[PDB]
Amino acid sequence: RECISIHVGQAGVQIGNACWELYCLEHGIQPDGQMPDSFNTFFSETGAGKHVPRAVFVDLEPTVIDEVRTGTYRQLFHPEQLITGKEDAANNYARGHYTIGKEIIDLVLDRIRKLADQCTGLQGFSVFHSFGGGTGSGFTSLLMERLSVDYGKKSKLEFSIYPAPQVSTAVVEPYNSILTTHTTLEHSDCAFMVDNEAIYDICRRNLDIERPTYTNLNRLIGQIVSSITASLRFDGALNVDLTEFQTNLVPYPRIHFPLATYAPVISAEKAYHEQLSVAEITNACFEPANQMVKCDPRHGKYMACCLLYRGDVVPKDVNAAIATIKTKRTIQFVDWCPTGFKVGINYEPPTVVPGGDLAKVQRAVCMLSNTTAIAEAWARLDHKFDLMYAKRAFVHWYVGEGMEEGEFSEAREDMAALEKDYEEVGV
Amino acid sequence: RECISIHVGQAGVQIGNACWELYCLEHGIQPDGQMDSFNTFFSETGAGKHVPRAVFVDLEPTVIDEVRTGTYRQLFHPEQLITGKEDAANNYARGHYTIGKEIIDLVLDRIRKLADQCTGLQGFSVFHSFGGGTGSGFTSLLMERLSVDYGKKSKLEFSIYPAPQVSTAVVEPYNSILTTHTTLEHSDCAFMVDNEAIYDICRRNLDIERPTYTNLNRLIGQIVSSITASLRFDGALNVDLTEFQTNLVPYPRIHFPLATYAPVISAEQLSVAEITNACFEPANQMVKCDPRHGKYMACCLLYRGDVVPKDVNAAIATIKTKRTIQFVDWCPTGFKVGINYEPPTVVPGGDLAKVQRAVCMLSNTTAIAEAWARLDHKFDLMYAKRAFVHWYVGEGMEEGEFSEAREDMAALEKDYEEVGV
Amino acid sequence: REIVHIQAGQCGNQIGAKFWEVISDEHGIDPTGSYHGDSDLQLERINVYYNEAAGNKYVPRAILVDLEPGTMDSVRSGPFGQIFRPDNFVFGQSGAGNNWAKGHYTEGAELVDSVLDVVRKESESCDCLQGFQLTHSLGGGTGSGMGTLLISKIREEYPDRIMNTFSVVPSPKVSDTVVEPYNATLSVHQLVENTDETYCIDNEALYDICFRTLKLTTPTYGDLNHLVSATMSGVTTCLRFPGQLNADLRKLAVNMVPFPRLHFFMPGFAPLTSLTVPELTQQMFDAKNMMAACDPRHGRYLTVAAVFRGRMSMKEVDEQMLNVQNKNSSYFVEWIPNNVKTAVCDIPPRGLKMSATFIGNSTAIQELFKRISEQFTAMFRRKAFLHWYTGEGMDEMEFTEAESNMNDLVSEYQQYQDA
Amino acid sequence: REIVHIQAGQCGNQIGAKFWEVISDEHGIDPTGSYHGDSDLQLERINVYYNEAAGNKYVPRAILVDLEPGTMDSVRSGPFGQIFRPDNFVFGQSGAGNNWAKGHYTEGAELVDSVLDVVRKESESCDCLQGFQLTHSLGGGTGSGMGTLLISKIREEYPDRIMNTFSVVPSPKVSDTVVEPYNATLSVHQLVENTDETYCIDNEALYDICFRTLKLTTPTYGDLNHLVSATMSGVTTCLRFPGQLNADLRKLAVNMVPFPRLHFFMPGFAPLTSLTVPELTQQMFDAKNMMAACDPRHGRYLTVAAVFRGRMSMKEVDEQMLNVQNKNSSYFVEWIPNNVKTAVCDIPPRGLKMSATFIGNSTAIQELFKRISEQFTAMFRRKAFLHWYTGEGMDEMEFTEAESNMNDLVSEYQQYQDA
Amino acid sequence: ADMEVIELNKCTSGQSFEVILKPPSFDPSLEEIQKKLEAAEERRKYQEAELLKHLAEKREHEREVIQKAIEENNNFIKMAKEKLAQKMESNKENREAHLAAMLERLQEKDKHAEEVRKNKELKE
Ligand SMILES: Nc1nc2c(ncn2[C@@H]2O[C@H](COP(=O)(O)OP(=O)(O)OP(=O)(O)O)[C@@H](O)[C@H]2O)c(=O)[nH]1
Ligand SMILES: Nc1nc2c(ncn2[C@@H]2O[C@H](COP(=O)(O)OP(=O)(O)OP(=O)(O)O)[C@@H](O)[C@H]2O)c(=O)[nH]1
Ligand SMILES: COc1cc2c(c(OC)c1OC)-c1ccc(OC)c(=O)cc1[C@@H](NC(=O)CS)CC2
Ligand SMILES: COc1cc2c(c(OC)c1OC)-c1ccc(OC)c(=O)cc1[C@@H](NC(=O)CS)CC2
Ligand SMILES: Nc1nc2c(ncn2[C@@H]2O[C@H](COP(=O)(O)OP(=O)(O)O)[C@@H](O)[C@H]2O)c(=O)[nH]1
Ligand SMILES: Nc1nc2c(ncn2[C@@H]2O[C@H](COP(=O)(O)OP(=O)(O)O)[C@@H](O)[C@H]2O)c(=O)[nH]1
Ligand SMILES: [Mg+2]
Ligand SMILES: [Mg+2]
Ligand SMILES: [Mg+2]
């Protein structure tokens, strides 16, 4: 039925800031308020005009949220769904999860419950946050723990941002990622990882931008997310229910992180070109250069594939495209699991931002796969962490806020385990 | 901030008489009265006059009387000139006990009358003879008591070490040893001036067959000027006493730095490199001896006049290449260089000429102890027979105080030698 | 979020004075007056370094401290003399020192409270206080002794916020006192304990840059400060200017200092004296261009942080910045991943069309501590000029206790040239 | 600072009378009148030897004592007879003596008070009294006996100030009495105890100088006094004249007498009778030219003091003065350092273009004491003329007690020809 | 290739259908735990309550230094103020005694003359 979005910390905020804008454009809601159920999934028809989101934005410093209460969309939200916190997260889980968090948790927790109160039978939360990064790791982890206390069943879907050297990280980043992903794991149902290097990469090979901005990256991520939710905003089979999301992608409680691949990304200017064939975009879906987490599944195995189409598309083709997508390709499905392909088509065409860098497209695909090769990213992170921890590199800052040296072991200890589970699923 | 000068006894008085005159000429104060910076040493009194922060004391009038006679008569206050009718007699025992006691309270109180118009005084510069009646006696007593009334405040003495030719007195060595003992635990840093060294410089340089006091004093005047200068002008070399001494004395044992004046040349331009070169030359010292023998444990260069550091450097470089560096084991290679742009003015009818630039060099060497020996020997050898001791026992001194004092000089001479590598 | 600036002791005061008038003209501020300059940015984070008072006026959040008038009245009747808030100056009057003891006990303690209670009014005035930064010399005493004291008293009243300092470490050439090594060692120990980050400006390095590489014979205290002053603007740029980072100054700490013992940074500047990019990097990573007498070669870098300046393409920067830690990839500790971060800002400094500055946490700094500890134990051997301190109240073993702490600092930096 | 002059007993009175008229013409003073003479100096320290009265007038600070009128009225109707203050003369009237006893007990004591009470007036009139000097003979009694008494009574009323005497020690040739040795010994003892310095003018020496080196056959008391009189001016010069020394007369004592036992000086003069410099020194250091019958050869010098006179270059004096204690460097005790001091003054004496005088504390003086103690124990053996004293009240053992003290003085001087 | 697809659901603006390709071939978050969180407060408040009880420690050694200083000085004055005074008492007593012994001997070889002139009264 209903559906709350939570955006915590800079990355979280700004990402949602850009996908709440694609949402509006998709459902035609002029910023201020109304349009001249279906999409009630995400908005609450407030007042006798306005349309307002079911979202909450939290950051531990103003700055980011302040720019939201400034630029148009200023009117779009309620002042109360925008929580801000004066003192910064400092860049270490330990602060966000303990010291600085505690102080703002009770105010957030209560407001998201103020939103869930006008929802006859809520469904769950979609949460957006950074992997490394101050409050993104810290506060998130704490939110989720307590969200599990106040909302027993209700599912939790996280949209995490896996950090990458070039789109500037922070030295301590790997600690933070490992740290959150530990506590946070036994509490999420299914999570969508997004490698910043992958998106930086797509913006280069495709949009052709020498220096990709955040505002450039986010727009693209916006689209992937839109395509992910979509299903449950327009209502029309395949993932029309948060439950049905995990039921289709995660076979194991170990919160599995599906690998997302977006269809045709092509720059305006190239806009008035040729419409890409239904067969072709599917064909571009089984292509590493177009993933969302840098790695490669021609290596590992697949244990649940999903195709989410959008626009002008009849199944008749989607079929013949699948047929030929198997013939001269790396099928490599895993031992005890069908050959999934829960196909979903959502006739509603892919709208894109007006001054954007991508053009309108006749039809687009999404493909959410749960492969074993996604663990190649859990490795890349562990190594960084392991190698720094080999000398207590920056640990003292965390012990400083009040953490145990033990929680560092105990967390990497899980990541050692997960990487084992992942590999263990192979044939 | 402020700075009191005290001149006790003949030598003390006359020396100051001549460097208070070089002071005036340096700061241009027409004797009569008038013309901060210049304030370190003078108190702007009345709505005209400039007057020194000094006190002159002697136990007979004579000397002081000539001061209240010759021009400069107006320059001081009548009070700052204390005089005492009965002489010191030439024996510490009198100056420190018998005849002193009587005038100490009156001096002590007047110098405090001077220090009262001084928002945050600094210390005293005291000029006195080594052997010599009240120079040894009274001085010693003054310093004891100054330490009682002025806790912290530093004491800088300018002592005159006696020498056979510019007439001494048979008993001189007793007196010197005597004062330098009591006086030692109470001074912070002292500048010794060998009368033989100055007699010597006036011969090799000024070319005077018979050097007068008035001839010697003029020269000493200059050395002293260059020493103080820094803290009179002001923002230059050795600012606020303390940082002056903190620079020369490494050990509480009052260390007596060795002074060497730059170019002394008679009236009727020397290179920056050359005068520095003349500074490491025994024939130009202030205490006859030689440091090519002992070691250096803190060197200081105090320039005056037209000088850029660019040269002072290249002069030092070459001053070490073909020379006896000989610095001591545990101490850098000092050379706190200080330049004081203000040119070296000299007395008008004087024997030395105006000079473009002059150097000062204050070094604390171990070889300065060669003078502490030359004195001990004289003393030791006379005391070997109680030579004149009875005159001291006569005023009321103990034969023990003679032992107890030489006893320290035995110790000092040990310490000095002990600092060697 | 907002920082106060303490500036104490002849060197500190002179150093900072140039800092102030240098950033003030960057932001476009008159001796008193406000803005004037067709730029617009400037003002965003002007907040950070300027509490602003009556009418237009800008007045820096600065406290001025010393134990002798002179040096202060040098500023007042000087560059941007009128800029500072009058009762923000804290005179000393009494004897200076040039002896630590005096400044950290006797003549020091005397003032402390009257300063502490002026930093207290600036701080509590701040909307959200970030921390303090202080400038002072480690040699001499009216700032190396009072300074190390001021800070020991800031933590205690502000454990909370972080402590930042720019400290000029002294050398045997271009020095006024024989005792400097005593004063230096005595502070180094203090710095280690109560500060989060300390920038080392070595004067030996400084002199070397003017004469060894800039034909400047007699190096004034002037063209020497010009170096420090330019470097200091470079180091802060990111917290006073754009909207790229933002710089919590805490984020800067948590990310530059891997190990508690406040690790001391050696800074470096690009073009100099009173520029292709590959040409700029090659220079900013050269020993011949560090602000501390060291030589990153004789030691690995723990973490490095560089900040460029001027209209230039980051495409080239990111490329050249990778090309340094490659032709030199052995000198970047490999147990800390992306340990070298670069920031670019596009508002040129004084003159200069292009500019870069560099912050480095390098174990080669060990070399500097070793050389001051060399003249220290070389003097404290046969207890040198020590009686100057004994006298002001200090104990003999408070020297050994400092020397001992300091050598460990060397024995730790030398421990992390590991694997 | 200021000295009074007692002058007692025929010899003393005559001796001093020439002294007075000799210095008076040096200073340019009339029989009464004041100054007259184109010189200007003179008057500085005229203070020292002349209390000045009504109008101009100069009147010497002199007390005249005797035990028989004659000798006094010899002065009054004589040289500068009018010069002395009238009630400053103290007549005796009664028997003279020429026997110590009479002058130190019976006829002596009788007067003492009336003299003492006049020295008391002169002294207490003095602005700052330096001490007394007395002239008298050791042989005979009206001054050798009253004198030694007068002084025994000055100390007691004046322990304070110092006692100076010029005493003529008598000889077997040119003598009026067989008893002189008794009178001499009896005083020598007294002098030893209550005086700080005593100059010995030996009459044996004196006679020798006139006949043995001056072709003068019958030596009057006249040309003989001329020697003593000239010597006495030479010895005092430095206290009555310049501004080179000043001479506290106590300074003179503290510096000439190493040992308490008042050591007796033998004086010597340069040119004589009634001069190149090397020629002047060679003479002033010659036995043949000492004022006491001795011979510095048979004994070392403890300390020596020489005072030149007249326009001559000190350059030469200091040179020659070193050249004496070199060609004779064995005769200057080496346990007392710079033990020979020389003073030069430029106001010539009577006649003489050049002049020098000499003061010597020499162990050879022993020779003199020995020779009077030789005729003493040579008479007191079989108790000679002794009954002349026994009778005036003296005790037999007061002679042995004197003799004993005296021989020690010899046994002490002879002790210091040590090493 | 040879697929056969089954179709679960046909909406208004959608259509979902699964396509099986080949036979697979096989066979309490706990509330109470905010005490974990408020264990960190009482460990951080410790860290700081330390480097504070450990800082006011330095503080009262600064009082001690300013103190051994002023008291260092005192014991130079009130020890060498009475080193002078009880030595210029050694002095008065010594000379006064030297000058009193010098009259003692003098007033007696005086009161002997008087007593042996009174011998010339019985004698002559
Ligand atoms: N894709 C994307 N990544 C971002 C964005 N902003 C920050 N990041 C990334 O997020 C990580 C840092 O997380 P932050 O959001 O800045 O951390 P935070 O504590 O939540 O935010 P602050 O409280 O402002 O420090 C790094 O990995 C960055 O690359 C963004 O707008 N888009
Ligand atoms: N350089 C220098 N030395 C002097 C001067 N006057 C005296 N002396 C020396 O000082 C020492 C004697 O000291 P005095 O000043 O005479 O002794 P005083 O007791 O202080 O003075 P008086 O009371 O006059 O005895 C000897 O070393 C002399 O050579 C002088 O004017 N200049
Ligand atoms: C009466 O006037 C005289 C007074 C004095 C001295 C003296 O002999 C030269 C006199 O002439 C007879 C005198 C004496 C003795 C010394 O030692 C032998 C001496 O060093 C020094 C002196 C004289 N002083 C000096 O030579 C001082 S530089 C002062 C005392
Ligand atoms: C004062 O402003 C600065 C503040 C900071 C940084 C910095 O670069 C040195 C600054 O410039 C001086 C900074 C530092 C260093 C890092 O590690 C070496 C890092 O990863 C990261 C940073 C900065 N953060 C980032 O670069 C993430 S984009 C934030 C902290
Ligand atoms: N670079 C820089 N260093 C200075 C300056 N002035 C002094 N110093 C150094 O700092 C040390 C002493 O500092 P100083 O300010 O004189 O001591 P203070 O009384 O504590 O302020 C000296 O050794 C100098 O090398 C300055 O103007 N700039
Ligand atoms: N040179 C000097 N000696 C004299 C003179 N008169 C006497 N004498 C010597 O002094 C001794 C005693 O002198 P005199 O005056 O008769 O004794 P008086 O009774 O004390 O005055 C004699 O033995 C002579 O040797 C004199 O005129 N001049
Ligand atoms: Mg953060
Ligand atoms: Mg004297
Ligand atoms: Mg200074």
Side-chain angles (χ1 to χ4, degrees), chain A residues 16-27:
Chain A
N17 210 358
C19 36
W20 269 104
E21 112 158 298
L22 192 92
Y23 281 170
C24 280
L25 255 50
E26 236 147 302
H27 299 280

mmCIF file with all atom_site columns, all heavy atoms in Angstrom, chain A residues 16-27:
data_model
loop_
_atom_site.group_PDB
_atom_site.id
_atom_site.type_symbol
_atom_site.label_atom_id
_atom_site.label_alt_id
_atom_site.label_comp_id
_atom_site.label_asym_id
_atom_site.label_entity_id
_atom_site.label_seq_id
_atom_site.pdbx_PDB_ins_code
_atom_site.Cartn_x
_atom_site.Cartn_y
_atom_site.Cartn_z
_atom_site.occupancy
_atom_site.B_iso_or_equiv
_atom_site.pdbx_formal_charge
_atom_site.auth_seq_id
_atom_site.auth_comp_id
_atom_site.auth_asym_id
_atom_site.auth_atom_id
_atom_site.pdbx_PDB_model_num
ATOM 1  N N   . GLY A 1 16 ? 18.526 11.505 -3.440  1.00 0.00 ? 16 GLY A N   1
ATOM 2  C CA  . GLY A 1 16 ? 17.079 11.571 -3.382  1.00 0.00 ? 16 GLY A CA  1
ATOM 3  C C   . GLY A 1 16 ? 16.553 12.878 -3.913  1.00 0.00 ? 16 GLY A C   1
ATOM 4  O O   . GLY A 1 16 ? 15.485 12.937 -4.505  1.00 0.00 ? 16 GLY A O   1
ATOM 5  N N   . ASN A 1 17 ? 17.326 13.928 -3.688  1.00 0.00 ? 17 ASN A N   1
ATOM 6  C CA  . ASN A 1 17 ? 16.975 15.230 -4.172  1.00 0.00 ? 17 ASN A CA  1
ATOM 7  C C   . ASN A 1 17 ? 16.792 15.163 -5.679  1.00 0.00 ? 17 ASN A C   1
ATOM 8  O O   . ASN A 1 17 ? 15.938 15.852 -6.236  1.00 0.00 ? 17 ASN A O   1
ATOM 9  C CB  . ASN A 1 17 ? 18.065 16.235 -3.817  1.00 0.00 ? 17 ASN A CB  1
ATOM 10 C CG  . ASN A 1 17 ? 17.518 17.647 -3.610  1.00 0.00 ? 17 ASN A CG  1
ATOM 11 O OD1 . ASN A 1 17 ? 16.298 17.917 -3.757  1.00 0.00 ? 17 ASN A OD1 1
ATOM 12 N ND2 . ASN A 1 17 ? 18.422 18.569 -3.262  1.00 0.00 ? 17 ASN A ND2 1
ATOM 13 N N   . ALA A 1 18 ? 17.568 14.310 -6.337  1.00 0.00 ? 18 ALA A N   1
ATOM 14 C CA  . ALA A 1 18 ? 17.505 14.208 -7.782  1.00 0.00 ? 18 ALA A CA  1
ATOM 15 C C   . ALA A 1 18 ? 16.527 13.161 -8.270  1.00 0.00 ? 18 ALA A C   1
ATOM 16 O O   . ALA A 1 18 ? 16.069 13.238 -9.397  1.00 0.00 ? 18 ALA A O   1
ATOM 17 C CB  . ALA A 1 18 ? 18.876 13.986 -8.353  1.00 0.00 ? 18 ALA A CB  1
ATOM 18 N N   . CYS A 1 19 ? 16.215 12.167 -7.446  1.00 0.00 ? 19 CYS A N   1
ATOM 19 C CA  . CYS A 1 19 ? 15.216 11.194 -7.873  1.00 0.00 ? 19 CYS A CA  1
ATOM 20 C C   . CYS A 1 19 ? 13.828 11.544 -7.386  1.00 0.00 ? 19 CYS A C   1
ATOM 21 O O   . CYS A 1 19 ? 12.866 10.916 -7.791  1.00 0.00 ? 19 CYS A O   1
ATOM 22 C CB  . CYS A 1 19 ? 15.565 9.711  -7.615  1.00 0.00 ? 19 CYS A CB  1
ATOM 23 S SG  . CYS A 1 19 ? 16.467 9.197  -6.145  1.00 0.00 ? 19 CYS A SG  1
ATOM 24 N N   . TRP A 1 20 ? 13.716 12.536 -6.512  1.00 0.00 ? 20 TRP A N   1
ATOM 25 C CA  . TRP A 1 20 ? 12.386 12.997 -6.126  1.00 0.00 ? 20 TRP A CA  1
ATOM 26 C C   . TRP A 1 20 ? 11.994 13.977 -7.224  1.00 0.00 ? 20 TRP A C   1
ATOM 27 O O   . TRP A 1 20 ? 10.821 14.239 -7.453  1.00 0.00 ? 20 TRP A O   1
ATOM 28 C CB  . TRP A 1 20 ? 12.307 13.616 -4.707  1.00 0.00 ? 20 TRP A CB  1
ATOM 29 C CG  . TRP A 1 20 ? 11.977 12.588 -3.662  1.00 0.00 ? 20 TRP A CG  1
ATOM 30 C CD1 . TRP A 1 20 ? 12.834 12.036 -2.778  1.00 0.00 ? 20 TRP A CD1 1
ATOM 31 C CD2 . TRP A 1 20 ? 10.720 11.959 -3.436  1.00 0.00 ? 20 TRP A CD2 1
ATOM 32 N NE1 . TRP A 1 20 ? 12.191 11.111 -1.996  1.00 0.00 ? 20 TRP A NE1 1
ATOM 33 C CE2 . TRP A 1 20 ? 10.887 11.043 -2.389  1.00 0.00 ? 20 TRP A CE2 1
ATOM 34 C CE3 . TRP A 1 20 ? 9.459  12.074 -4.014  1.00 0.00 ? 20 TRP A CE3 1
ATOM 35 C CZ2 . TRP A 1 20 ? 9.849  10.252 -1.908  1.00 0.00 ? 20 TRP A CZ2 1
ATOM 36 C CZ3 . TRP A 1 20 ? 8.419  11.283 -3.533  1.00 0.00 ? 20 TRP A CZ3 1
ATOM 37 C CH2 . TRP A 1 20 ? 8.622  10.387 -2.493  1.00 0.00 ? 20 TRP A CH2 1
ATOM 38 N N   . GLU A 1 21 ? 12.988 14.482 -7.935  1.00 0.00 ? 21 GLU A N   1
ATOM 39 C CA  . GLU A 1 21 ? 12.718 15.410 -9.006  1.00 0.00 ? 21 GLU A CA  1
ATOM 40 C C   . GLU A 1 21 ? 12.345 14.657 -10.281 1.00 0.00 ? 21 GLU A C   1
ATOM 41 O O   . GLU A 1 21 ? 11.576 15.154 -11.100 1.00 0.00 ? 21 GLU A O   1
ATOM 42 C CB  . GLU A 1 21 ? 13.906 16.343 -9.212  1.00 0.00 ? 21 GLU A CB  1
ATOM 43 C CG  . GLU A 1 21 ? 14.673 16.173 -10.523 1.00 0.00 ? 21 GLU A CG  1
ATOM 44 C CD  . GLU A 1 21 ? 15.468 17.416 -10.922 1.00 0.00 ? 21 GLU A CD  1
ATOM 45 O OE1 . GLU A 1 21 ? 14.826 18.481 -11.138 1.00 0.00 ? 21 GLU A OE1 1
ATOM 46 O OE2 . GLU A 1 21 ? 16.728 17.332 -11.033 1.00 0.00 ? 21 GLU A OE2 1
ATOM 47 N N   . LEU A 1 22 ? 12.881 13.457 -10.452 1.00 0.00 ? 22 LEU A N   1
ATOM 48 C CA  . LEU A 1 22 ? 12.553 12.676 -11.627 1.00 0.00 ? 22 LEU A CA  1
ATOM 49 C C   . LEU A 1 22 ? 11.196 12.110 -11.371 1.00 0.00 ? 22 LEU A C   1
ATOM 50 O O   . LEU A 1 22 ? 10.439 11.904 -12.296 1.00 0.00 ? 22 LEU A O   1
ATOM 51 C CB  . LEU A 1 22 ? 13.560 11.558 -11.846 1.00 0.00 ? 22 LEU A CB  1
ATOM 52 C CG  . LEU A 1 22 ? 13.528 10.810 -13.180 1.00 0.00 ? 22 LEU A CG  1
ATOM 53 C CD1 . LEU A 1 22 ? 14.474 11.419 -14.208 1.00 0.00 ? 22 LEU A CD1 1
ATOM 54 C CD2 . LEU A 1 22 ? 13.908 9.379  -12.951 1.00 0.00 ? 22 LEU A CD2 1
ATOM 55 N N   . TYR A 1 23 ? 10.891 11.861 -10.102 1.00 0.00 ? 23 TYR A N   1
ATOM 56 C CA  . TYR A 1 23 ? 9.592  11.335 -9.743  1.00 0.00 ? 23 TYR A CA  1
ATOM 57 C C   . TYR A 1 23 ? 8.572  12.363 -10.167 1.00 0.00 ? 23 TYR A C   1
ATOM 58 O O   . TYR A 1 23 ? 7.705  12.066 -10.983 1.00 0.00 ? 23 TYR A O   1
ATOM 59 C CB  . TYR A 1 23 ? 9.457  11.081 -8.250  1.00 0.00 ? 23 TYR A CB  1
ATOM 60 C CG  . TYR A 1 23 ? 10.105 9.822  -7.741  1.00 0.00 ? 23 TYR A CG  1
ATOM 61 C CD1 . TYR A 1 23 ? 10.224 9.612  -6.379  1.00 0.00 ? 23 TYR A CD1 1
ATOM 62 C CD2 . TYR A 1 23 ? 10.613 8.853  -8.596  1.00 0.00 ? 23 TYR A CD2 1
ATOM 63 C CE1 . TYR A 1 23 ? 10.829 8.476  -5.866  1.00 0.00 ? 23 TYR A CE1 1
ATOM 64 C CE2 . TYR A 1 23 ? 11.224 7.702  -8.095  1.00 0.00 ? 23 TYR A CE2 1
ATOM 65 C CZ  . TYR A 1 23 ? 11.321 7.526  -6.722  1.00 0.00 ? 23 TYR A CZ  1
ATOM 66 O OH  . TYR A 1 23 ? 11.921 6.425  -6.162  1.00 0.00 ? 23 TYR A OH  1
ATOM 67 N N   . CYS A 1 24 ? 8.682  13.576 -9.641  1.00 0.00 ? 24 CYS A N   1
ATOM 68 C CA  . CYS A 1 24 ? 7.746  14.632 -9.995  1.00 0.00 ? 24 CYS A CA  1
ATOM 69 C C   . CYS A 1 24 ? 7.528  14.701 -11.493 1.00 0.00 ? 24 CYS A C   1
ATOM 70 O O   . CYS A 1 24 ? 6.386  14.703 -11.960 1.00 0.00 ? 24 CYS A O   1
ATOM 71 C CB  . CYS A 1 24 ? 8.245  15.977 -9.499  1.00 0.00 ? 24 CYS A CB  1
ATOM 72 S SG  . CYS A 1 24 ? 7.901  16.176 -7.769  1.00 0.00 ? 24 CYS A SG  1
ATOM 73 N N   . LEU A 1 25 ? 8.625  14.725 -12.244 1.00 0.00 ? 25 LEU A N   1
ATOM 74 C CA  . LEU A 1 25 ? 8.547  14.849 -13.684 1.00 0.00 ? 25 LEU A CA  1
ATOM 75 C C   . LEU A 1 25 ? 7.808  13.675 -14.288 1.00 0.00 ? 25 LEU A C   1
ATOM 76 O O   . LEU A 1 25 ? 7.040  13.851 -15.213 1.00 0.00 ? 25 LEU A O   1
ATOM 77 C CB  . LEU A 1 25 ? 9.934  15.030 -14.282 1.00 0.00 ? 25 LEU A CB  1
ATOM 78 C CG  . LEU A 1 25 ? 10.302 16.441 -14.765 1.00 0.00 ? 25 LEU A CG  1
ATOM 79 C CD1 . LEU A 1 25 ? 10.029 17.565 -13.747 1.00 0.00 ? 25 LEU A CD1 1
ATOM 80 C CD2 . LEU A 1 25 ? 11.765 16.437 -15.148 1.00 0.00 ? 25 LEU A CD2 1
ATOM 81 N N   . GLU A 1 26 ? 8.015  12.488 -13.729 1.00 0.00 ? 26 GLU A N   1
ATOM 82 C CA  . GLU A 1 26 ? 7.355  11.268 -14.187 1.00 0.00 ? 26 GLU A CA  1
ATOM 83 C C   . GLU A 1 26 ? 5.847  11.326 -13.978 1.00 0.00 ? 26 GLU A C   1
ATOM 84 O O   . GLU A 1 26 ? 5.087  10.911 -14.845 1.00 0.00 ? 26 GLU A O   1
ATOM 85 C CB  . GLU A 1 26 ? 7.903  10.061 -13.428 1.00 0.00 ? 26 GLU A CB  1
ATOM 86 C CG  . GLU A 1 26 ? 8.470  8.946  -14.290 1.00 0.00 ? 26 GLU A CG  1
ATOM 87 C CD  . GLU A 1 26 ? 9.634  8.244  -13.610 1.00 0.00 ? 26 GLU A CD  1
ATOM 88 O OE1 . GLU A 1 26 ? 10.612 8.949  -13.290 1.00 0.00 ? 26 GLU A OE1 1
ATOM 89 O OE2 . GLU A 1 26 ? 9.574  7.003  -13.389 1.00 0.00 ? 26 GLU A OE2 1
ATOM 90 N N   . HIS A 1 27 ? 5.423  11.832 -12.824 1.00 0.00 ? 27 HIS A N   1
ATOM 91 C CA  . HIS A 1 27 ? 4.004  11.918 -12.490 1.00 0.00 ? 27 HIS A CA  1
ATOM 92 C C   . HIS A 1 27 ? 3.408  13.294 -12.697 1.00 0.00 ? 27 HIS A C   1
ATOM 93 O O   . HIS A 1 27 ? 2.252  13.538 -12.323 1.00 0.00 ? 27 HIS A O   1
ATOM 94 C CB  . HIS A 1 27 ? 3.784  11.503 -11.055 1.00 0.00 ? 27 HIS A CB  1
ATOM 95 C CG  . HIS A 1 27 ? 4.188  10.101 -10.778 1.00 0.00 ? 27 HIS A CG  1
ATOM 96 N ND1 . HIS A 1 27 ? 3.394  9.028  -11.101 1.00 0.00 ? 27 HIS A ND1 1
ATOM 97 C CD2 . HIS A 1 27 ? 5.303  9.596  -10.213 1.00 0.00 ? 27 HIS A CD2 1
ATOM 98 C CE1 . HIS A 1 27 ? 4.000  7.916  -10.736 1.00 0.00 ? 27 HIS A CE1 1
ATOM 99 N NE2 . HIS A 1 27 ? 5.162  8.233  -10.195 1.00 0.00 ? 27 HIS A NE2 1
#
